[PDB]
Coordinates of C-alpha atoms in Angstrom, one line a residue:
Chain B
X1 CA 27.0 -22.6 -18.1
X2 CA 23.4 -24.0 -17.8
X3 CA 23.7 -24.4 -14.1
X4 CA 22.5 -20.8 -14.3
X5 CA 19.2 -21.8 -15.7
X6 CA 19.2 -24.7 -13.2
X7 CA 19.4 -22.0 -10.4
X8 CA 16.7 -20.0 -12.2
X9 CA 14.4 -23.1 -12.0
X10 CA 15.3 -23.3 -8.3
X11 CA 14.3 -19.7 -7.8
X12 CA 11.1 -20.4 -9.7
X13 CA 10.4 -23.2 -7.3
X14 CA 11.0 -20.7 -4.5
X15 CA 8.8 -17.9 -5.8
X16 CA 5.9 -20.1 -6.7
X17 CA 6.1 -21.3 -3.1
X18 CA 5.5 -17.8 -1.7
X19 CA 3.2 -16.2 -4.4
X20 CA 0.5 -17.5 -6.7
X21 CA 0.8 -18.0 -10.4
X22 CA -0.5 -14.6 -11.6
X23 CA 1.8 -12.4 -9.5
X24 CA 4.7 -14.8 -9.8
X25 CA 4.5 -14.6 -13.6
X26 CA 4.1 -10.8 -13.4
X27 CA 7.3 -10.5 -11.4
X28 CA 9.3 -13.3 -13.1
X29 CA 9.3 -11.1 -16.2
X30 CA 10.6 -8.3 -13.9
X31 CA 8.0 -5.7 -14.8
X32 CA 9.7 -2.9 -12.8
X33 CA 13.4 -2.8 -11.8
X34 CA 12.6 -1.5 -8.3
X35 CA 10.6 -4.6 -7.5
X36 CA 13.6 -6.9 -8.3
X37 CA 15.9 -4.5 -6.4
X38 CA 13.7 -5.2 -3.5
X39 CA 13.7 -8.9 -4.0
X40 CA 17.5 -9.0 -3.7
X41 CA 8.9 -2.0 -3.7
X42 CA 5.8 -4.1 -4.3
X43 CA 2.1 -3.7 -5.2
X44 CA -0.9 -4.5 -3.1
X45 CA -4.5 -4.6 -4.4
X46 CA -7.9 -4.9 -2.9
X47 CA -10.4 -7.2 -4.6
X48 CA -14.1 -7.5 -3.9
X49 CA -16.5 -10.5 -3.5
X50 CA -14.0 -13.3 -2.9
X51 CA -14.4 -16.6 -1.0
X52 CA -12.2 -17.4 1.9
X53 CA -12.1 -20.9 3.5
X54 CA -10.5 -21.9 6.8
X55 CA -10.1 -25.3 8.3
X56 CA -8.7 -26.3 11.7
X57 CA -7.8 -29.8 12.9
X58 CA -10.2 -30.6 15.7
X59 CA -8.5 -32.1 18.8
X60 CA -5.0 -31.8 17.4
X61 CA -3.4 -32.0 20.9
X62 CA -4.0 -35.7 21.6
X63 CA -3.5 -36.6 17.9
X64 CA -0.1 -35.1 18.6
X65 CA 0.2 -36.3 22.2
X66 CA 3.0 -38.9 22.3
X67 CA 4.8 -39.0 18.9
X68 CA 8.5 -39.5 18.2
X69 CA 8.5 -35.9 16.7
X70 CA 8.5 -37.4 13.2
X71 CA 5.2 -39.1 12.4
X72 CA 3.2 -35.9 12.8
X73 CA 5.3 -34.1 10.2
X74 CA 4.7 -36.9 7.7
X75 CA 1.0 -37.3 8.3
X76 CA 0.4 -33.5 8.1
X77 CA 2.4 -33.4 4.8
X78 CA 0.1 -36.2 3.5
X79 CA -2.9 -34.2 4.5
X80 CA -1.7 -31.0 2.9
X81 CA -0.6 -32.8 -0.3
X82 CA -4.1 -34.2 -0.7
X83 CA -5.5 -30.7 0.1
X84 CA -3.4 -29.0 -2.5
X85 CA -4.3 -31.7 -5.0
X86 CA -7.9 -30.7 -4.2
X87 CA -7.0 -27.0 -4.6
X88 CA -5.4 -27.4 -8.0
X89 CA -8.4 -29.4 -9.0
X90 CA -10.8 -26.7 -7.8
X91 CA -8.4 -23.9 -9.1
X92 CA -8.5 -22.3 -5.6
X93 CA -5.3 -20.9 -4.1
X94 CA -3.9 -22.1 -0.8
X95 CA -2.6 -19.2 1.3
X96 CA -0.8 -20.2 4.5
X97 CA -0.8 -22.6 7.4
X98 CA -1.3 -21.9 11.1
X99 CA -0.5 -25.0 13.1
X100 CA -3.8 -26.9 13.5
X101 CA -5.2 -24.8 10.6
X102 CA -5.0 -24.6 6.8
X103 CA -6.8 -22.3 4.5
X104 CA -7.4 -21.1 1.0
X105 CA -9.0 -18.3 -1.1
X106 CA -10.9 -18.2 -4.3
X107 CA -10.5 -15.7 -7.1
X108 CA -8.3 -13.1 -5.5
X109 CA -5.8 -12.7 -8.3
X110 CA -8.5 -13.2 -11.0
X111 CA -12.2 -13.3 -9.7
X112 CA -14.2 -16.2 -11.1
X113 CA -18.0 -16.0 -11.6
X114 CA -18.6 -19.1 -9.4
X115 CA -15.7 -18.9 -6.9
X116 CA -17.6 -19.7 -3.7
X117 CA -19.0 -22.7 -5.5
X118 CA -15.5 -24.0 -6.0
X119 CA -14.7 -23.1 -2.5
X120 CA -17.5 -25.0 -0.8
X121 CA -16.9 -28.0 -3.1
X122 CA -13.3 -27.8 -2.1
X123 CA -14.6 -28.0 1.5
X124 CA -16.6 -31.1 0.7
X125 CA -13.4 -32.6 -0.8
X126 CA -11.6 -31.7 2.5
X127 CA -14.3 -33.6 4.4
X128 CA -13.8 -36.6 2.2
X129 CA -10.0 -36.4 2.5
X130 CA -10.1 -36.2 6.2
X131 CA -12.6 -39.0 6.7
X132 CA -10.5 -41.2 4.4
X133 CA -7.3 -40.4 6.2
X134 CA -9.1 -41.1 9.4
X135 CA -10.3 -44.6 8.3
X136 CA -6.9 -45.1 6.7
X137 CA -4.3 -44.2 9.3
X138 CA -6.7 -45.1 12.2
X139 CA -6.3 -41.6 13.7
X140 CA -9.7 -40.3 15.0
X141 CA -9.5 -36.6 14.2
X142 CA -11.5 -34.5 11.7
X143 CA -11.6 -30.8 10.8
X144 CA -13.8 -27.9 11.5
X145 CA -14.4 -25.7 8.4
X146 CA -15.6 -22.1 8.2
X147 CA -16.2 -20.3 5.0
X148 CA -17.0 -16.6 4.3
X149 CA -17.1 -14.2 1.4
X150 CA -16.7 -10.5 0.9
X151 CA -13.8 -8.1 0.0
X152 CA -10.2 -8.2 1.0
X153 CA -7.0 -6.3 0.3
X154 CA -4.2 -8.8 -0.5
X155 CA -0.5 -8.3 -1.1
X156 CA 2.7 -8.9 0.8
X157 CA 4.2 -7.4 4.0
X158 CA 7.6 -7.4 5.5
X159 CA 10.9 -8.2 3.9
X160 CA 11.8 -11.1 6.2
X161 CA 9.7 -14.2 5.9
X162 CA 7.3 -12.1 3.8
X163 CA 4.5 -14.1 2.4
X164 CA 1.6 -13.2 0.1
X165 CA -1.4 -12.8 2.3
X166 CA -4.8 -11.2 2.7
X167 CA -6.3 -8.7 5.2
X168 CA -9.8 -7.3 5.9
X169 CA -12.7 -7.8 8.3
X170 CA -13.4 -10.8 6.1
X171 CA -10.3 -12.4 7.6
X172 CA -11.6 -12.0 11.1
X173 CA -15.1 -13.2 10.0
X174 CA -13.8 -16.4 8.3
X175 CA -11.5 -17.0 11.3
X176 CA -14.4 -16.8 13.8
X177 CA -16.9 -18.8 11.6
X178 CA -14.2 -21.4 11.8
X179 CA -13.8 -21.0 15.5
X180 CA -17.6 -21.2 15.6
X181 CA -17.6 -23.9 12.9
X182 CA -18.9 -27.4 13.5
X183 CA -16.8 -30.5 13.5
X184 CA -16.9 -32.1 10.1
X185 CA -19.4 -29.8 8.4
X186 CA -18.9 -26.3 6.8
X187 CA -20.1 -23.1 8.6
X188 CA -21.4 -20.7 6.0
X189 CA -23.0 -17.3 6.0
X190 CA -25.4 -15.4 3.7
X191 CA -22.3 -13.8 2.2
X192 CA -21.9 -17.3 0.8
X193 CA -25.6 -18.0 0.4
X194 CA -26.5 -14.7 -1.4
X195 CA -25.3 -16.3 -4.6
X196 CA -25.6 -20.0 -3.7
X197 CA -28.7 -21.1 -5.7
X198 CA -29.7 -23.7 -3.0
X199 CA -28.1 -26.6 -4.9
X200 CA -27.1 -28.4 -1.7
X201 CA -28.1 -29.8 1.7
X202 CA -28.5 -26.5 3.5
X203 CA -29.4 -26.1 7.1
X204 CA -30.1 -23.1 9.2
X205 CA -26.7 -23.5 10.9
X206 CA -26.6 -20.9 13.7
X207 CA -25.0 -20.7 17.2
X208 CA -27.0 -22.4 19.9
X209 CA -25.9 -19.8 22.4
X210 CA -26.1 -12.8 11.4
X211 CA -27.7 -14.9 8.6
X212 CA -25.6 -18.0 9.3
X213 CA -26.1 -21.5 7.8
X214 CA -24.5 -24.9 7.7
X215 CA -23.8 -27.3 4.9
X216 CA -23.0 -31.0 5.4
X217 CA -23.0 -32.2 1.8
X218 CA -25.0 -32.5 -1.4
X219 CA 29.2 -14.7 -15.6
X220 CA 26.0 -13.6 -13.9
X221 CA 25.4 -16.9 -12.1
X222 CA 26.7 -15.3 -8.8
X223 CA 24.1 -12.6 -9.1
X224 CA 21.5 -15.4 -9.5
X225 CA 23.1 -17.3 -6.7
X226 CA 22.9 -14.5 -4.2
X227 CA 19.3 -13.9 -5.2
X228 CA 18.2 -17.5 -4.9
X229 CA 20.2 -18.3 -1.8
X230 CA 18.7 -15.2 -0.2
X231 CA 15.2 -16.3 -1.1
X232 CA 15.9 -19.7 0.4
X233 CA 17.2 -18.2 3.7
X234 CA 14.1 -16.0 3.5
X235 CA 11.6 -18.9 3.5
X236 CA 13.6 -21.4 5.6
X237 CA 16.5 -21.1 8.0
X238 CA 20.1 -22.2 7.6
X239 CA 20.5 -25.4 9.7
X240 CA 17.2 -26.8 8.3
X241 CA 18.4 -25.8 4.8
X242 CA 21.4 -28.1 5.3
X243 CA 19.6 -30.9 7.0
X244 CA 17.1 -31.2 4.1
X245 CA 19.7 -30.2 1.5
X246 CA 21.1 -33.7 2.0
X247 CA 17.8 -35.3 2.7
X248 CA 14.1 -35.3 1.8
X249 CA 12.3 -33.7 4.8
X250 CA 12.9 -32.4 8.3
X251 CA 11.5 -32.9 11.8
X252 CA 12.9 -31.9 15.2
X253 CA 11.8 -31.8 18.8
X254 CA 13.0 -28.8 20.8
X255 CA 12.0 -29.3 24.5
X256 CA 12.6 -25.7 25.4
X257 CA 12.1 -22.8 23.0
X258 CA 10.3 -19.5 23.9
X259 CA 7.6 -18.1 21.6
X260 CA 6.2 -14.6 21.7
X261 CA 3.3 -13.1 19.8
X262 CA 2.8 -9.4 19.2
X263 CA -0.5 -8.1 17.8
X264 CA -1.5 -4.5 16.9
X265 CA -4.7 -4.1 18.8
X266 CA -5.9 -0.6 17.9
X267 CA -5.4 -1.2 14.2
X268 CA -8.9 -2.2 13.3
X269 CA -10.5 0.9 14.8
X270 CA -8.2 3.0 12.6
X271 CA -8.8 0.8 9.5
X272 CA -11.8 3.0 8.4
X273 CA -12.2 2.4 4.7
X274 CA -13.9 5.6 3.4
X275 CA -10.7 5.7 1.3
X276 CA -10.5 3.6 -1.8
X277 CA -9.3 0.2 -0.6
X278 CA -7.6 1.3 2.6
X279 CA -4.3 0.1 1.0
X280 CA -2.3 3.1 2.3
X281 CA -3.1 2.4 5.9
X282 CA -1.7 -1.1 5.2
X283 CA 1.2 0.5 3.5
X284 CA 2.0 2.2 6.8
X285 CA 1.4 -1.3 8.4
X286 CA 4.1 -2.6 6.0
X287 CA 6.4 0.2 7.1
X288 CA 6.0 -0.9 10.7
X289 CA 6.3 -4.6 9.9
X290 CA 9.5 -4.0 8.0
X291 CA 10.9 -2.0 10.9
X292 CA 10.1 -5.0 13.1
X293 CA 12.0 -7.2 10.5
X294 CA 15.0 -4.9 10.4
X295 CA 15.2 -5.3 14.2
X296 CA 16.4 -8.9 13.6
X297 CA 19.6 -7.6 11.9
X298 CA 21.2 -7.0 15.2
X299 CA 24.2 -9.2 16.0
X300 CA 23.0 -10.1 19.5
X301 CA 19.8 -11.0 17.6
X302 CA 21.2 -14.2 16.2
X303 CA 19.3 -16.9 18.1
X304 CA 15.9 -15.3 17.3
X305 CA 13.9 -16.4 14.3
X306 CA 10.7 -14.8 12.9
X307 CA 8.5 -17.8 12.3
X308 CA 5.9 -15.9 10.2
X309 CA 3.4 -13.1 10.2
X310 CA -0.1 -14.2 11.0
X311 CA -2.4 -11.7 9.4
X312 CA -1.3 -8.6 11.2
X313 CA 0.5 -10.6 13.9
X314 CA 4.3 -11.1 14.4
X315 CA 5.4 -14.5 15.5
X316 CA 9.0 -14.7 16.9
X317 CA 10.7 -17.7 18.5
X318 CA 14.2 -18.8 19.6
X319 CA 16.1 -21.7 21.1
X320 CA 16.0 -23.6 17.8
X321 CA 19.0 -22.9 15.7
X322 CA 22.1 -23.2 18.0
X323 CA 22.1 -26.9 18.8
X324 CA 25.5 -26.4 20.5
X325 CA 25.3 -26.2 24.3
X326 CA 28.2 -23.9 24.9
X327 CA 30.3 -24.1 28.0
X328 CA 31.0 -20.4 27.4
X329 CA 27.3 -19.6 27.2
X330 CA 24.4 -20.1 29.7
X331 CA 21.8 -22.4 28.2
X332 CA 19.0 -20.0 29.4
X333 CA 20.2 -16.6 28.3
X334 CA 18.4 -17.1 25.0
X335 CA 15.1 -16.3 26.7
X336 CA 16.6 -13.3 28.4
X337 CA 17.7 -11.9 25.1
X338 CA 14.3 -12.8 23.7
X339 CA 12.6 -10.7 26.3
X340 CA 15.1 -8.0 25.6
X341 CA 14.1 -8.1 22.0
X342 CA 10.5 -7.7 23.2
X343 CA 11.3 -4.6 25.2
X344 CA 13.3 -3.2 22.3
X345 CA 10.6 -3.8 19.8
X346 CA 8.2 -2.1 22.2
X347 CA 10.7 0.8 22.0
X348 CA 10.5 0.6 18.2
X349 CA 6.7 0.8 18.1
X350 CA 7.0 3.7 20.5
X351 CA 9.4 5.4 18.1
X352 CA 7.0 4.7 15.2
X353 CA 4.3 6.2 17.3
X354 CA 6.3 9.4 17.6
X355 CA 5.9 9.8 13.9
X356 CA 2.4 8.4 13.6
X357 CA 0.2 11.5 13.1
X358 CA -2.3 11.9 15.9
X359 CA -2.7 8.2 16.5
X360 CA -1.1 5.5 18.6
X361 CA -0.8 1.9 17.5
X362 CA -0.4 -0.2 20.6
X363 CA 0.4 -3.9 20.7
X364 CA -0.3 -6.8 23.1
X365 CA 2.4 -9.3 23.5
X366 CA 2.3 -12.9 24.8
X367 CA 5.1 -15.1 26.0
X368 CA 5.5 -18.9 26.5
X369 CA 8.2 -21.6 26.5
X370 CA 8.6 -25.3 26.8
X371 CA 8.6 -28.3 24.4
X372 CA 7.6 -28.0 20.8
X373 CA 8.3 -29.6 17.4
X374 CA 9.8 -27.8 14.3
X375 CA 9.2 -29.0 10.8
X376 CA 9.1 -28.2 7.1
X377 CA 5.9 -28.9 5.2
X378 CA 6.1 -28.2 1.5
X379 CA 7.7 -30.3 -1.2
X380 CA 7.6 -28.7 -4.7
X381 CA 6.4 -26.0 -2.3
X382 CA 7.9 -25.0 1.1
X383 CA 6.7 -23.9 4.5
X384 CA 8.6 -23.9 7.8
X385 CA 6.6 -24.1 11.0
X386 CA 6.3 -25.3 14.5
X387 CA 3.7 -27.1 16.7
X388 CA 3.1 -28.5 20.2
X389 CA 1.6 -27.2 23.3
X390 CA 3.7 -24.1 23.6
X391 CA 2.5 -22.6 20.3
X392 CA -1.3 -22.6 20.8
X393 CA -0.7 -22.0 24.5
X394 CA 1.0 -18.7 23.7
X395 CA -1.7 -17.9 21.1
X396 CA -4.6 -18.3 23.5
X397 CA -2.5 -16.4 26.1
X398 CA -1.8 -13.3 23.9
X399 CA -5.4 -13.5 22.6
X400 CA -6.3 -12.4 26.2
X401 CA -3.7 -9.6 26.6
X402 CA -3.8 -5.9 27.0
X403 CA -1.6 -3.6 24.9
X404 CA 1.8 -2.5 26.1
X405 CA 1.6 -5.3 28.7
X406 CA 3.7 -8.4 28.4
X407 CA 1.5 -11.3 29.3
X408 CA 3.8 -14.2 30.4
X409 CA 3.1 -17.8 31.3
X410 CA 3.3 -18.7 35.0
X411 CA 6.3 -21.1 34.6
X412 CA 8.1 -18.7 32.3
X413 CA 7.2 -16.1 35.0
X414 CA 9.0 -18.3 37.5
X415 CA 12.1 -18.9 35.4
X416 CA 12.3 -15.2 34.5
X417 CA 11.7 -13.7 38.0
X418 CA 15.1 -15.1 38.9
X419 CA 16.5 -13.3 35.9
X420 CA 15.8 -10.0 37.6
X421 CA 12.8 -8.7 35.7
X422 CA 10.0 -7.2 37.9
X423 CA 6.4 -8.3 37.4
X424 CA 2.9 -7.7 38.6
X425 CA 0.4 -10.5 38.8
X426 CA -2.5 -10.1 36.4
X427 CA -4.7 -13.0 37.5
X428 CA -5.5 -16.6 36.7
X429 CA -6.9 -17.2 33.2
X430 CA -8.9 -20.3 32.0
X431 CA -7.0 -22.2 29.3
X432 CA -8.5 -24.8 27.0
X433 CA -7.2 -28.2 28.1
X434 CA -5.3 -26.7 31.0
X435 CA -8.0 -24.8 33.0
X436 CA -7.0 -21.9 35.2
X437 CA -3.5 -20.5 34.6
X438 CA -1.7 -17.7 36.4
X439 CA -0.6 -14.8 34.3
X440 CA 1.9 -12.0 35.0
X441 CA 3.0 -8.7 33.4
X442 CA 6.3 -7.0 33.1
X443 CA 5.3 -3.3 33.2
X444 CA 5.5 -2.2 36.8
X445 CA 2.7 0.4 37.3
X446 CA 3.0 2.0 33.9
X447 CA -0.5 3.5 34.3
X448 CA -1.8 6.1 36.7
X449 CA -2.7 3.4 39.2
Chain J
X1 CA 22.0 19.5 2.5
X2 CA 25.7 19.2 3.5
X3 CA 25.2 17.4 6.8
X4 CA 21.5 17.8 7.0
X5 CA 21.3 17.9 10.8
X6 CA 20.2 21.6 10.9
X7 CA 16.8 20.3 9.5
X8 CA 16.8 17.5 12.1
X9 CA 16.9 19.8 15.1
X10 CA 14.6 22.1 13.1
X11 CA 12.0 19.3 13.1
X12 CA 12.6 18.4 16.7
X13 CA 12.1 22.0 17.7
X14 CA 9.0 22.3 15.6
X15 CA 7.6 19.3 17.6
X16 CA 9.0 20.8 20.9
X17 CA 8.0 24.4 20.2
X18 CA 11.3 26.0 21.4
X19 CA 11.0 29.4 19.6
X20 CA 14.5 30.8 20.3
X21 CA 16.1 27.5 19.1
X22 CA 14.2 27.8 15.8
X23 CA 15.4 31.4 15.5
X24 CA 19.0 30.4 16.1
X25 CA 18.7 27.5 13.7
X26 CA 17.3 29.6 10.9
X27 CA 19.9 32.3 11.6
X28 CA 22.4 29.5 11.1
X29 CA 20.8 28.6 7.8
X30 CA 18.7 25.6 8.8
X31 CA 16.9 24.4 5.7
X32 CA 13.4 25.8 6.0
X33 CA 12.0 22.8 4.1
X34 CA 14.1 19.9 5.5
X35 CA 12.0 16.9 6.4
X36 CA 12.3 13.7 8.4
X37 CA 12.1 10.2 7.1
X38 CA 8.3 10.1 6.8
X39 CA 7.9 13.2 4.7
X40 CA 7.0 15.3 7.7
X41 CA 8.1 18.9 7.4
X42 CA 8.6 21.3 10.4
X43 CA 5.2 22.9 9.5
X44 CA 3.7 19.5 10.2
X45 CA 5.2 19.1 13.7
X46 CA 4.2 22.7 14.3
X47 CA 0.6 22.2 13.3
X48 CA 0.6 19.1 15.5
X49 CA 1.7 20.8 18.8
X50 CA 0.0 24.1 18.2
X51 CA 3.0 26.4 18.2
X52 CA 1.3 29.1 16.1
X53 CA 4.2 31.5 16.7
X54 CA 6.7 29.1 15.2
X55 CA 4.3 28.5 12.3
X56 CA 4.4 32.3 11.8
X57 CA 8.2 32.4 11.9
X58 CA 8.5 29.4 9.5
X59 CA 6.2 30.9 7.0
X60 CA 8.3 34.1 7.4
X61 CA 11.3 31.8 6.8
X62 CA 9.6 30.7 3.5
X63 CA 8.6 27.1 4.3
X64 CA 6.6 25.2 1.7
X65 CA 2.9 25.8 1.9
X66 CA 1.7 22.5 0.4
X67 CA 4.5 20.1 1.6
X68 CA 3.0 16.6 1.9
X69 CA 4.0 13.9 4.3
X70 CA 4.5 10.3 3.1
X71 CA 0.8 10.0 3.5
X72 CA 0.3 13.0 1.3
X73 CA -1.3 15.0 4.1
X74 CA -0.2 18.6 4.1
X75 CA 0.1 20.5 7.5
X76 CA -3.0 22.1 6.2
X77 CA -4.5 18.6 6.3
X78 CA -2.9 18.2 9.7
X79 CA -4.5 21.2 11.4
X80 CA -7.7 20.3 9.6
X81 CA -7.7 16.9 11.3
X82 CA -6.7 18.8 14.5
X83 CA -8.7 22.0 14.8
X84 CA -6.2 24.8 15.7
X85 CA -8.4 27.5 14.2
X86 CA -5.6 30.1 14.5
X87 CA -3.1 28.0 12.5
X88 CA -5.8 27.1 10.0
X89 CA -6.5 30.7 9.3
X90 CA -2.9 31.8 9.2
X91 CA -2.2 29.1 6.6
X92 CA -5.2 30.2 4.6
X93 CA -3.5 33.6 4.6
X94 CA -0.2 32.2 3.2
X95 CA -1.8 30.5 0.2
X96 CA -3.0 27.0 1.3
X97 CA -4.4 24.9 -1.6
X98 CA -8.1 24.3 -1.2
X99 CA -9.1 21.7 -3.7
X100 CA -6.3 19.3 -3.1
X101 CA -6.5 16.0 -1.4
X102 CA -4.1 13.6 0.3
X103 CA -3.4 10.1 -1.1
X104 CA -6.6 9.2 0.9
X105 CA -8.4 11.3 -1.7
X106 CA -10.1 13.5 0.9
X107 CA -10.1 17.3 1.2
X108 CA -9.0 18.6 4.6
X109 CA -12.5 20.1 5.1
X110 CA -13.7 16.5 5.3
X111 CA -11.0 16.0 7.9
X112 CA -12.4 18.8 10.0
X113 CA -15.8 17.1 9.4
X114 CA -14.7 13.7 10.8
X115 CA -13.3 15.7 13.8
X116 CA -16.9 16.8 14.3
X117 CA -15.3 20.3 14.1
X118 CA -17.9 22.7 12.6
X119 CA -15.4 25.5 13.2
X120 CA -12.8 24.6 10.5
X121 CA -15.6 23.2 8.4
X122 CA -17.3 26.6 8.1
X123 CA -13.8 28.2 7.9
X124 CA -13.0 26.4 4.7
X125 CA -16.6 26.8 3.5
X126 CA -15.9 30.5 2.9
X127 CA -13.0 30.0 0.5
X128 CA -12.9 29.0 -3.2

C-alpha cells in the first residue's frame, strides 16, 4: 500500500544521512541504472577553491573520564545538534565525525562566491556554542579550530560503510592546522586570507616553535525493503539497529574491544596530479578499499565491524556485537581472529600489489584493545562511532608506524604473545597522557637485517 | 572463452617469462588476447618483466597492439614508463599508436620523460 512510500521516506532519511542535498537529489531520481544497481558505479569530482573547517574537542579525555557510558553520548549529541543548526544556517555541509573531532566543508557540491566567509563565521558560531555549553553544563572544555582552503576531490569510497568524503593535500593541511590550532580561536592561512578583505580581528597567528594567521572574533515493497534495510545495515549494525529500533538513542560500554588502523603510507608520493583531477588514482584507491570491504564477507569474519574510513584510512574493530559469552567459545579468540584478519588483509594488499603496475602501496597498521564506549550520534541523521582511551591510543600509535609492520600495544603484546604469535620489540614511544609506551611488531626479520 | 583458464596461465607465464610454456599454451589455443581482471593483457606482463622473446612470439601470435589496461595504459605505455628500449622498438615495428594517451591524458613519450629516460624519448621523437 502506502507503507511503500513510508519506506521510501525512510530510505530518504538514510541517504540524506550519508550524502548531501545535491548528490542525494541527483541519485534519488536514479539518473543511471548502474548507480542504483550498485546501491542495492558512482561518480567522483574534484572541485577547486573550497573551504574546509576542522574542530577537535580539547582535553576530551578527562571530560570523558568517569562517566556512566551514557552522559557523554547525550552531551555530544547536543553539541553536534547545535553545530548542524549552525551549518544549516551558514549553508555549509557537515562531512563526518572523528571521535574528539567534527568538521565541515563549504561549497564543494556548488561553490559559493563567499564560502570561506560562511566557514569562518560558522567557526565563530562554534566558539559561541562551545562557550555557552561550557557555562551551561559546567563542563570545562572548549574546541580547537583549524580552517583551510584550496582544492579537493570529493566523492565516495568503498561499498561497506561508504560515506561521502573528500581527499587532497588540503585534507592534511586542514588537519594539521587543527592539530596546530589554538584552543578557542581559529587557525587560518593565507589560503583563507587571500580573499578575506580584512573584515575581522586578524592576528599574525603562527607557530611559536607558511603565511599563517589567527582569528579570535570580529508488489515492489520487498524490493524497496531489501534496499532500505541494506542501507540501514550499511550505516549502523544489527544489534544497535534493534536497540534503537525500540528506543530513541543508544550507548554502550565495552570494556574490551580491539581496534586496528591501517593507513596507505606511500599513496601521497604517488598522488602526483599532472593528470586532470587525479580522480583515476583515487578510483584505484576505491578498488583497493572495496577489496578490503569484500574481505569482511568471510563467515569467520562475523565479529569484526568496519567502523568507518577516515580519509584514506581503514578503521576496523571487534568485540562489540556478540554480547553472549559462549561456553563453547573462548572469550579472547575474537582478538586472535582480528589479528588473522590483519594478516590476511596484508595478504590482500600484497595481491593488489601484484597487479599494481610498477608501484607498491604499503600500509602501516596499529593495534590496541581495552575499554571503550560505542554510541550512535545522529537523529534525523545517523552516525555510529566509538570513543574512549583505546581509540585515540591506537590512532597515535599507528600514526608512528612503519609500513608492513604491525605496531601493537604493550599489553595487547602481552596477551597475544601467549597466543603464539612471534614479535620483535620496536622500542618505547612517548604517548600523550601516558608517556613512554613499549611497542612491538609481528614481522620477524622481514627485511635484510 | 569456454573455460578461460588458458588465458590465465598465459598471463602468468607472461609475467613469469616461461617461453616454452607460452609456446605450449598457444599451440593449445590459448586466447592471444585474454586479459586478467584489471585489463592487463599478456603483452603488459611481458613489457613489465622484459621478456622480449615472448613479446616477439605473442606479436607473432597476433596479440592486440593497443590493448589498454583498466588504467587505459597500453603495454606501449608500460614499456615507455619502463625503458626496455628493445621492446619499445619492436612494438614500434608492429604498429604501436603514437598520438594516443591513457585515461591520464598523457602520451607514453611523457612517460619516458618522467622516467628521466632520454632513450625512449628520442626513440618516439623520430616517429609521426
